[PDB]
Design a protein around this ligand. Structure first.
Ligand code: MN
Ligand code: MN
Lengths: 197, 197
């Protein structure tokens, strides 16, 4: 059922912020593995015909015998699918959400310091998120491949803090990785996800 | 109070199984970070003069203000301290526990298949363990820096499946990493920990 989406750019398009070796392994191996395991878990079930957003939104209703496989591999597919679309080689910091962030945090620089603090604080594997929670912007972090959509919050930006996302280039220096992320955020896609709510 | 232990061997001693670049970063950065944060949690407390094993065994009675910091960083300090001692450049597959494994599983290769399967199936960051429970051996995995000692089971072998442990050499290929581990297990130390029970 589910397919590995193509990247919207070359593996080396985000250099020198994200390394081309990481982009290839992250997409062609890790994300591909999530698609493979997700297809195995939903094969022959009533989940087969559902969009991955509908599955992750309604994860709490997935049968107990496949719920962990779908939480982990469905989460992995959705989160990596959003991540590729939310990166861009020629990121401009403007648009609807940048204006909303400035209004709420006072500056982009204040927003980035809170985002970096929470992203650096996530212990073990997970994600940092900008979400809309009942019309208000919030930063949250989740473990493993958990997604805030499961708790009725709409993600508009995410950031992978699994070690596979940064180890080849940055090793233990997750703060340097978070720093490099601001250079490649696709604020056009962030706006698109925000305006859809 | 707590100090970063000295490795018992050179950073390149476990080549070609575990790369020297990883051994240096793993010990000097990741383990060092857990010691720093553990010392900040416990400074001037009761816990400051206790062994890390008694702290981690009794986590359920550490007060809520520092419980998470001690779980994560206390865990990180104990788990990495045990890991360095349980690796050797002079691994020999014999002794008390190797014989017990052969008796219980039938052969070392069947034990290794079960361990490799459970270690491969730990989703996100964590550890695979050989524990003593109810007079027999059991393979268990835990998330992040959780340690079976906290649940009253004594570990005798552990294996780090945090991506920092293998990403520079193995990238996504966790099974090849698990394969390499058998070549550097300190079965002398495994016997020491087992016979102490
Ligand atoms: Mn990832
Ligand atoms: Mn480690």
């Amino acid at each position: 059922a589910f397919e590995l989406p193509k990247l919207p750019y070359a593996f080396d398009a985000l250099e020198p912020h994200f390394d081309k070796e990481t982009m290839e392994i992250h997409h062609d191996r890790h994300h591909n593995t999530y698609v493979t395991k997700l297809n195995a878990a939903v094969e022959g079930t009533d989940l087969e015909s559902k969009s991955i957003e509908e599955i992750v939104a309604n994860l709490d209703s997935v049968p107990a015998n496949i719920q962990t496989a779908v939480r982990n591999n469905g989460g992995g597919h959705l989160n990596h699918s959003l991540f590729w679309e939310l990166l861009s080689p020629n990121s401009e910091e403007k648009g609807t959400v940048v204006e909303k962030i400035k209004e709420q945090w006072g500056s982009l620089e204040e927003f980035k310091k809170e985002f970096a603090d929470k992203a650096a604080a996530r212990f073990g594997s997970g994600w940092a998120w900008l979400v809309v929670n009942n019309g208000q912007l919030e930063i949250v972090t989740t473990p493993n491949q958990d997604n805030p959509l499961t708790e009725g919050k709409t993600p508009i930006l995410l950031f992978d803090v699994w070690e596979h996302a940064y180890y080849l280039k940055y090793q233990n220096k997750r703060p340097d990785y978070i720093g490099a992320f601001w250079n490649v955020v696709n604020w056009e896609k962030v706006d698109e996800l925000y305006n859809a709510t």
